[PDB]
Design a protein around this nucleic acid. Structure first.
Ligand SMILES: [Zn+2]
Ligand SMILES: [Zn+2]
Ligand SMILES: [Zn+2]
Length: 89
DNA sequence: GACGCTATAAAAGGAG
DNA sequence: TCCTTTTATAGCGTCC
């Protein structure tokens, strides 16, 4: 089976191949946020979101644009940005 | 128009 | 496999 682990909430019913990913997903239903920022004590649903968040404190911007070389704290922001060099206003 | 930021999904790494 | 960590995608909010 491609994606064995199914979500128990009948409304959702999203599928995952890895069990961790299902557990992480069920958390959006339970509202459990096990990842805590040790600076402001805010809780996050994922390690990824906590890590992206820690950068807002440290000011680190590890994502650079290939075209203009401008820096960004997150991958999405960087990727979405790159698309402005391909069009006008 | 742009982008800072959180959410969420999906994949991958590593150890036993 | 279980658990950790990384990579990809979707909006919201706000200032310009
Ligand atoms: Zn669900
Ligand atoms: Zn914090
Ligand atoms: Zn650029």
């Amino acid at each position: 089976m491609e994606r064995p682990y199914a979500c128990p909430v009948e409304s959702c019913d999203r599928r995952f191949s890895q069990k961790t990913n299902l557990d992480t997903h069920i958390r959006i239903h339970t509202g459990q946020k096990p990842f805590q920022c040790r600076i402001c004590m805010r809780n996050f649903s994922q390690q990824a979101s906590l890590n992206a968040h820690i950068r807002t404190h440290t000011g680190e911007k590890p994502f650079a644009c290939d075209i203009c070389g401008r820096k960004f704290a997150t991958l999405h922001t960087r990727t979405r940005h790159t698309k402005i060099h391909l069009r006008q206003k």
